[PDB]
Design a protein around this ligand. Structure first.
Ligand SMILES: Nc1ncnc2c1ncn2[C@@H]1O[C@H](COP(=O)(O)OP(=O)(O)OP(O)(O)=S)[C@@H](O)[C@H]1O
Ligand SMILES: [Mg+2]
Ligand SMILES: [Mg+2]
Lengths: 317, 1058
């Protein structure tokens, strides 16, 4: 189930984390995750075990032992845990909480306690790790993005339009672009001055895409750095070109008549390794495999009783 | 027939609205402002235009919108912008002109008329004349008028009018006489021509009919010389009385201009200029004033002002202040007052006393501005304090009476005290210090106390504020002899009536440890006892049965003292309150709460020392013996078990076993089950079993709780109804009903376990707010008010609440409607949980989706609809709505300042006969609800979907928002009165307990709370640094009250979807 080349995980309000086989839509295994909805899923870079950030815990089920229950739990944090992220070298884990803290967890030791804590005023919605492993980007509900240097413990903050909550932030593998999306439905793109190694690492503003009218819920760069995906409460994942910042392909799930009242938000996405395909989490209980270029629904992962708010997607050798 | 004509309209509106519900069109929107206008509902229609603007910029031209919004000043500068960028455009000019004839800008209207006379358009030629006639009228030029009148058709009412004026000037009275009658008839036939769907031309008909009747009086003022007093009187009175917007009064005066020049009318035009300043039309007021002075728009700007007409100069000076030029304005004052005192002291040769007097009263008004302006320019500090205190004392000297001056002087002294006290908490934050402090504070305290006294006696009817202040100094100053003597002086001096306003505030400190303070309180209370006992018994009786010794002692003293003159009243009151407390929580009802609590401490907390403290007052409670059949019937079925369950407890007290203690709980759980079964059976109480003494009561001299007021004949408890419906609830309150000696019944709600003392102060606050609203003309024009109810505390446990007739809770009206229409009552809830079993733990974002999901699959009509179906007609329906919209908005703002939390759909109700709204349960005041740990309210007041929906469509833009400003504007004007009241019970000693609940010294917390309030009353509630004006603040609030992000977080019970 972690032995398959393709890991696809889907979690939500129905107390299960289901695993699917990408190419067929057959659900492989399903794991119990009771007492809470799942806020984030991320598979460890080691492909050993998957993390499930929830309400006051991060449970971590095993992808290798193909059966049991949480290997590790993390506790003693009040309010939700919204973001997870791992450091390449097996051992660190980062979190954003409603408790206003960005926390660094030691995966290779004991303690319900975490190695470090970076506190902000206003809850953190997203946490992502610059590919250089040296900086953490942290977006809060006030509308401040924080670059937190993991070495100097130096914090530096930047707010775009905000008095508005920033919902997610991401940064392309080649560390050339950083993007942040907020509750207005805007998408901000910055250029990355690669200071690094005796660091500076600066942000230079490039565009504000009017991505959506409604809430924008996630944003994400393809491995390519070719495209940028934007999921939203307008039941839409929009894929933008990085060369243009124009709309390449719109994926949407909105009725076909004004008298339907929606059914489903576009909660999250993940690109495939080759940037050819994109997975989609929605509140209509489905994950979906789209073709990035045609905007064609190539599959539909039906299973969850209740909503789906999470994906994790893995392609490594 | 007339009352029947509006009915069809109201009926058409309902449907016309229902249409708009399905699809908002410019078509409907047009036929909506019109029908709302025939229905003579101006502001509701103004709301339709707001929505018309924000959704269709489509009758276009931002200048056309400003013109329909009667904002002539914006439309004029927006038409200039539109003219200088565009071309000539014959329509843009007409609009540019209409702005001028509204503004009374005759200079620019006549110029614009002549200077642009190409006017190849013939319709542009027709309208052109009407305006340029009146323009020429204001500018004296009669030649121009005649020319432009010769172009107005005599068919129009307008054309017939300006002939009557041209004739009356040239002295052709028979011509003038006929033209009037023709102008009337051409207006009568025209009001039937546009039979309803017209402008403020139906309201401006009163302007033309007023002017025509006044123009006949101007006729009276030309040949037969005897009404020059009679005519000037009506002209004068039907002015202070009349309330017509600036623009209309211009025209009205222009009629009177034909006969009297402003220089003889003075008082008339000064009052008019006075109105122009108040309604923010300064540049016009100036021009009226310049005329009266007969001297420059002071183009000679460096020169002194002319003192020729002392009164006019004064106006000018304040116009200058209210204008931009206010250091200048301040400067001219100091100098004018100096000129004024010399013009008195010297030029007063005796045979001129009226002038001296009227000159001395003008100075008092000058001095008050002086101090007030000094404060505005500089603030309060070691340099200003003495200056303004001199300015105010000076004002006090020159008028002697005049509440304003004595008030101002009192508050300044009171704020000197505050300034140094708050400067000294500044010092102590980082012996000769305290001695100079004590000297300092005493120096301003004594005169403050003095000042507030003479000012109280100058209100009489309206002095709650000043009175409360007297008590602040009185209580706060642990009494230095000087400040005491000043108080005693005042207490003698001022009427006893006064203190009734403030009885709960006085009783709050009966047991004051400071010996000099208590003595005065005790004496003053006794004297209030002497005249108006009744006003005193209930609150004293409560106090006299109090755990704290010093209270009930001191309370009994005054009660004893009251027996020397009103003994049987004191006696009756004593008993009625005693019996009611017994009735409120019966013996078994206490044992039930006392057994729950006792099993939590023991079986769930291992606390036998606390547990023994729960049961021992219950055992000694019965130790006294039964006194009512209901007590004996309890004592039968339960007594022995308990009297022996205690026996086992007291075996363990000495043995220290655990098998001794388990025999007790064996017995205790027996009676618990027995009672618990009988509890849903209590749905009625009978006096003959529960309290016989109360049944016995006939024609007492005790007044019906909270009905006593002087002015009004005393209404006594003539009989108590024998049955009390028990409202089956969590606290099972009783519905007590009394028969009054006037005939009428009086229903109350006897509550057992809720300290009613807060609810009492809140009603006090409301009373004040009600006065304030009754006094503000607009708020009166609209009837704005809070419905209140009588609150009579009986102990810390219990008390009485006035039953409001014709009311049902929001929750009831809905429970009914939904069951009637076969909708599951709690459906939004069941939808939400089906979607998200873990709703409560979702991230904000997650919640908003689920919330929206629920909302989008359930109707929002209910309240709107059940209110339509209820109504017996459509005008009754329409009015009930107008009342509803307004009263809800009132309590939205007032509730906000109060910090009134917990407004779930069982805590507000709607009177079903007027539609006006009513708030109950004032437990959560000040931010409390929002500060709480579990489920903190994010909402400033409930402005929920079904409440919005029930107003007119175009809701919040219309009546609601307009009323919101009005109410708030009043609350800001009178921010001190409101704070006097609020300070009185945040710092109230026996009431501070409701903020230590932030756990689940107080000096510091209480400071916060009151600041948070001042912040709200000064528009500093949102950002620390901004100072938001009303409509901004209001908008910010409505926003906050409406946010899905805020609502979805609400504890589900609160029903954020109703
Ligand atoms: N001033 C009043 N006028 C008319 N009816 C009232 C008044 N106060 C309460 N009621 C009614 O009495 C019912 C009982 O509610 P409450 O008076 O609040 O007693 P309660 O049982 O303590 O309520 P809780 O604390 O919310 S369970 C309400 O549903 C109202 O209909
Ligand atoms: Mg209640
Ligand atoms: Mg209650």
């Amino acid at each position: 189930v972690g032995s398959d080349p393709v890991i696809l995980a889907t979690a939500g309000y129905d107390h299960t984390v289901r695993f699917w086989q990408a190419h067929s839509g057959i659900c492989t295994r399903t794991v119990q995750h009771q007492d809470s909805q799942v806020n984030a899923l991320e598979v460890t870079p080691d492909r050993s075990m998957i993390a499930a950030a929830g309400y006051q815990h991060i449970r971590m089920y095993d992808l290798n032992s193909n059966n049991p229950n949480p290997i590790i739990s993390y506790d003693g944090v009040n309010k939700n845990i919204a973001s997870v992220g791992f450091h390449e070298d097996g051992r660190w884990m980062y979190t954003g909480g409603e408790d206003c803290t960005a926390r660094i967890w030691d995966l290779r030791s004991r303690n319900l306690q975490c190695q470090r804590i970076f506190q902000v005023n206003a809850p953190i919605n997203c946490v992502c790790l610059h590919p250089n492993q040296a900086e953490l980007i942290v977006g809060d509900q006030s509308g401040a993005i924080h670059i937190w240097d993991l070495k100097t413990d130096h914090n530096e903050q930047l707010i775009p339009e905000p008095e508005v909550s920033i919902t997610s932030a991401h940064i392309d593998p080649d560390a050339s672009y950083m993007a942040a999306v907020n509750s207005t439905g805007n998408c901000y793109v910055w250029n990355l001055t690669g200071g690094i190694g005796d660091e500076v690492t600066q942000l230079i503003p490039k565009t504000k895409i009017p991505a959506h009218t409604r809430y924008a819920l996630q944003c994400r760069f393809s491995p390519d750095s070719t495209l940028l995906a934007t999921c939203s409460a307008d039941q839409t994942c929009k894929i933008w070109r990085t060369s243009n910042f124009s709309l390449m392909t719109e994926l949407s799930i909105k009725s076909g008549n004004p008298g339907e009242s929606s059914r489903g938000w576009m909660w999250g996405c993940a690109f495939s390794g080759d940037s050819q395909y994109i997975v989609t989490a929605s509140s209509d209980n489905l994950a979906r495999l789209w073709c990035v270029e045609t905007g064609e629904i190539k599959r539909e992962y039906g299973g969850h009783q209740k909503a789906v708010v999470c994906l994790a997607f893995n392609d490594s050798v | 027939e007339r009352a029947a004509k509006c009915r069809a309209y109201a009926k058409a509106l309902h449907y016309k609205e229902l249409e708009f519900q399905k699809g908002p069109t410019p078509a409907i929107l047009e036929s909506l402002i019109s029908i709302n206008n025939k229905l003579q509902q101006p502001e509701a229609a103004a709301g339709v235009l707001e929505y018309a603007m924000k959704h269709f910029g489509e009758l276009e031209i931002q200048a056309t919108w400003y013109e329909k919004l009667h904002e002539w000043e914006d439309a004029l500068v927006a038409y200039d912008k539109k003219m200088d960028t565009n071309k000539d455009d014959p329509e843009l000019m007409l609009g540019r002109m209409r702005c001028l004839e509204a503004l009374g800008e005759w200079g620019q209207l006549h110029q614009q008329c002549c200077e642009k006379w190409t006017l190849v358009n013939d319709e542009t030629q027709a309208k052109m004349a009407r305006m340029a006639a009146a323009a020429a009228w204001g500018l004296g030029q009669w030649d121009s008028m005649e020319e432009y009148t010769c172009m107005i058709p005599r068919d129009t009412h307008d054309g017939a009018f300006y002939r009557a004026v041209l004739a009356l000037h040239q002295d052709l009275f028979s011509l003038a006489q006929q033209c009037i009658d023709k102008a009337r008839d051409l207006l009568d036939a025209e009001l039937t021509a546009m039979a309803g769907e017209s402008y403020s031309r139906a309201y401006g008909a009163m302007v033309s009919c007023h002017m025509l009747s006044e123009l006949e009086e101007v006729i009276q003022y030309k040949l037969v010389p005897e009404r020059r007093e009679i005519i000037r009187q009506i002209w004068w009175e039907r002015l202070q009385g009349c309330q017509r917007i600036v623009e209309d009064w211009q025209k009205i005066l222009m009629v009177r201009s034909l006969v009297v020049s402003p220089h003889e009318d003075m008082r008339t035009w000064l009052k008019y200029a006075s109105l122009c300043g108040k309604s923010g039309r300064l540049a016009l007021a100036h021009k009226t004033l310049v005329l009266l002075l007969g001297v420059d728009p002071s183009r000679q700007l460096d020169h002194p002002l002319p003192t020729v007409h002392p009164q006019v100069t004064y106006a000018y000076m304040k116009n200058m202040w209210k204008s931009a030029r206010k250091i200048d304005a301040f400067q001219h004052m100091q100098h004018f007052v100096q000129t004024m005192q010399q013009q008195a002291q010297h030029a007063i040769a005796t045979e001129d006393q009226q002038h001296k007097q009227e000159l001395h009263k003008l100075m008092a008004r000058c001095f008050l501005k002086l101090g007030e302006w000094q404060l505005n320019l500089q603030g309060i500090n070691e340099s200003t304090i003495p200056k303004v205190l001199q300015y105010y004392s000076a004002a006090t000297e020159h008028d002697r009476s005049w509440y304003k001056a004595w008030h101002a002087w009192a508050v300044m002294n009171f704020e000197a005290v505050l300034h140094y006290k708050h400067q000294n908490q500044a010092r102590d934050e980082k012996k000769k210090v305290t001695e100079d402090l004590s000297k300092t504070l005493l120096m301003y305290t004594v005169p403050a106390v003095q000042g507030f006294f003479r000012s109280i006696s100058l209100s009489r009817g309206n002095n709650l504020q000043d009175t409360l202040r007297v008590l602040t100094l009185w209580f706060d100053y642990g009494h230095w002899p000087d400040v005491n003597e000043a108080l005693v002086e005042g207490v003698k001096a001022i009427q006893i009536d006064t203190w009734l306003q403030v009885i709960p505030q006085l009783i709050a400190r009966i047991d004051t440890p400071r010996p000099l303070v208590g003595r005065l309180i005790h004496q003053l209370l006794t004297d209030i006892g002497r005249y108006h006992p009744q006003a005193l018994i209930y609150p004293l009786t409560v106090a006299s049965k109090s755990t704290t010794t010093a209270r009930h002692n001191a309370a009994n003293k005054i009660l004893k003292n009251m027996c020397e003159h009103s003994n049987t009243l004191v006696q009756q009151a004593m008993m009625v309150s005693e019996e009611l407390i017994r009735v409120a929580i019966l013996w078994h009802e206490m044992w039930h709460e006392g057994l729950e609590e006792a099993s939590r401490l023991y079986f769930g907390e291992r606390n036998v020392k606390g547990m023994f403290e729960v049961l021992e007052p219950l055992h000694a409670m019965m130790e006294r013996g039964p006194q009512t059949l209901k007590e004996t019937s309890f004592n039968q079925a339960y007594g022995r078990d308990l009297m022996e369950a205690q026996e086992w407890c007291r075996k363990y007290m000495k043995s220290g076993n655990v098998k001794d203690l388990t025999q007790a709980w064996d017995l205790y759980y027996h009676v618990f089950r027995r009672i618990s079964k009988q509890l849903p059976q209590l749905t009625s109480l009978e006096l003959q079993y529960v309290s016989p003494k109360l049944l016995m009561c006939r024609d007492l001299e005790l007044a019906v709780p909270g009905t006593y007021d002087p002015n009004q004949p005393i209404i006594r408890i003539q009989s108590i109804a024998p049955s009390l419906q028990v409202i089956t609830s969590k606290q099972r309150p009783r519905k007590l009903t009394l028969m009054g000696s006037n005939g009428h019944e009086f229903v109350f709600l006897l509550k057992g376990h809720e300290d009613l003392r807060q609810d009492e102060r809140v009603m006090q606050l409301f009373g004040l707010v009600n006065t304030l609203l009754a006094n503000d003309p607009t708020s009166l024009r609209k009837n704005l008010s809070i419905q209140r109810y009588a609150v009579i505390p009986l102990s810390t446990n219990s008390g009485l609440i006035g039953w409001v007739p014709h009311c049902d809770t929001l929750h009831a009206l809905i429970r009914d409607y939904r069951e009637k229409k076969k909708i599951l009552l709690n459906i939004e809830h069941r939808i939400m949980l089906r979607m998200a079993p873990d709703y409560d733990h979702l991230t904000l974002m997650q919640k908003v989706e689920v919330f929206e999901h629920a909302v989008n699959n359930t109707a929002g009509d209910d309240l709107a609809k059940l209110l339509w179906l209820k109504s017996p007609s459509s005008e009754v329906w329409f009015d009930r709505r107008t009342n509803y919209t307004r009263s809800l908005a009132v309590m939205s703002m007032v509730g906000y300042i109060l910090g009134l939390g917990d407004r779930h759909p069982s805590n507000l109700m709607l009177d079903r006969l007027s539609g006006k709204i009513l708030h109950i349960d004032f437990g959560d005041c000040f931010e409390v609800a929002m500060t709480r740990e579990k489920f903190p309210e994010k909402i400033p007041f409930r402005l929920t979907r079904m409440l919005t929906n029930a107003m007119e469509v175009t809701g919040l833009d219309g009546n609601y928002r307009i009323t919101c400003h009005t109410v708030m504007e009043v609350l800001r004007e009178h921010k001190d009165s409101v704070m006097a009241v609020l300070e009185a019970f945040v710092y109230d000693p026996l009431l501070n307990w409701r903020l230590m609940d932030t756990n689940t010294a107080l000096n510091k917390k209480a400071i916060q709370i009151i600041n948070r309030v001042r912040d709200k009353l000064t528009g500093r509630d949102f950002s620390h640094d901004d100072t938001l004006d009303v409509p901004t603040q209001v908008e910010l609030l409505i926003k906050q009250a409406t946010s899905h992000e805020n609502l979805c977080q609400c504890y589900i019970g609160w029903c954020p979807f109703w």
